[PDB]
Amino acid sequence: RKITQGDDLAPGVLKIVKVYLAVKRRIQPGDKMAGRHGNKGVISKINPIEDM
Amino acid sequence: EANLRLVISIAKKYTNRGLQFLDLIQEGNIGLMKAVDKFEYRRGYKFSTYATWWIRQAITRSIADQARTIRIPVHMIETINKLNRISRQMLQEMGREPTPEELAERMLMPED
Amino acid sequence: LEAFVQSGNKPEWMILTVLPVLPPDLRPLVPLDGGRFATSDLNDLYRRVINRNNRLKRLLDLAAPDIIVRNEKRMLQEAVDALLDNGRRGRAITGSNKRPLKSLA
């Protein structure tokens, strides 16, 4: 009964509802990268292993 | 004119951020008109007591339903404030958060 | 004065006797689903002006002590000029979360 607990939601609200999302924000271009020594910048293409 | 100071000492109590530090004094100065018109000194009693009743509630009503967004028959205005007055027990006797379920015993009545 | 003559102005317009009122849809009065209302700023500033002016009226309508009329004139000009350009009159009109209210200016 911290789950089955209720709380007032002020005069104007009988009930409230929620959902949470595990958003798998994958590796992609336009996203940002860096290293420890102050190099900071955008991922500007993904290259085949030989395109390198 | 003879009572313009007694209007401040009563009104300034209620001006405590209530809506503004000022305006309730000038509404008390108009409640004072009904008081000066019905001043029954012929009962025996004094204008101090007259002001403590009538002019005090003219000062109360000056921002109870006047100057609001909303206005109702007055029993249904100040009853919302009976609940806020009662909440002074709730916030220390249940004493961690407020609960309408406690207010139901403190009012002997159903929530709806 | 030459600019008044060449453009159609009149000096009475310095010292007005009528406040025009901002149309509600520019301060959009509506209710909200949370049982609360669009009461913001450009509405509430007019509540304070309406109240002060409705006292000044009643005080003249009853021929009250001129003290109460003189104070309510000063309070009415305070509220009109703060509705026009809040803060600029060496003071501002405010609400419980300490802030000033947004003026017409």
Q: Residue B99: list chain A partners with CB under 8 A.
A: 8
Q: Decide if B99 touches A, using CB distance below 8 A.
A: yes
Q: Which residues of B touch A7 (CB under 8 A)?
A: 97
Chains with ≥3 CB–CB distances under 8 Å to C: A, B
* Cβ–Cβ under 8 Å, residues C26 and C13: no
Q: How far is C100 from chain B (nearest CA, A)?
A: 13
What are the two backbone dihedrals, phi and then psi, of residue C6, each rounded to the nearest 5 degrees? -80, -5
- Distance CA(B34)–CA(C54), nearest Å, equals 17
Structure tokens at B68: 């609001």
Own/partner contacts of A34-41, CB < 8 Å, gap of 24 or more, are: none
Based on the number of CB atoms within 10 Å of its own CB, is A20 exposed (0-12), middle (13-18) or buried (19 or more)?
exposed
> Is the CB of residue A13 less than 8 Å away from at least one CB of chain C?
yes
Between chains, do A11 and C35 touch, taking CB under 8 Å as contact? yes
Per CB-CB distance under 8 Å, the chain A contacts of B100 are: 8
The structure tokens listed for C102 are: 């947004």
Give the three-state DSSP class for A44: coil
Within 10 angstroms of residue C44's Cβ, the number of other Cβ atoms is 19
Please judge whether C75 and B20 are an interchain contact, meaning their C-beta atoms are less than 8 angstroms apart: no
How far apart CA C81 and CA C74 sit, in angstroms, is 11
Smallest Cα–Cα separation from C19: which of C75, C69, C76, C58?
Answer: C76
* Distance separating alpha carbons of residues C46 and A38, to the nearest angstrom: 55
CB neighbour burial string for C11-26, b if at least 16 within 10 angstroms, e if fewer = eeeeeeeeeeeeeeee
Closest residue, chain A, to C37 (C-alpha): A12
Asked if B10 and B59 touch (Cβ cutoff 8 Å), the reply is: yes
- The runs of H, that is alpha helices, within chain A are none
Which residue in the set C52, C55, C67 is minimally distant from B30, CB to CB? C55
**Among B56, B60, B71, B54, which residue's Cα sits nearest to residue B18?**
B60
Helix H or strand E segment including C7 = helix C2-7
User: What was the experiment behind these coordinates?
Assistant: cryo-EM
Q: Resolution (in Å) of the shown entry?
A: 17.0
Helices (H), B15-74: 23-37, 47-50, 56-64
Chains in touch with A (3+ beta-carbon pairs under 8 Å) read B, C
Contact criterion met (CB < 8 Å) for C68 and B17? no
Q: Which residues of chain C does A11 touch, with a Cβ-Cβ cutoff of 8 Å?
A: 35
Rounded CA-CA distance C53/C55 in Å is 5
CA atoms of B82 and C81, how far apart (whole Å): 38
Rounded CA separation C101/C92 (Å) = 8
Q: Nearest C-alpha of chain B: how many angstroms from A8?
A: 7
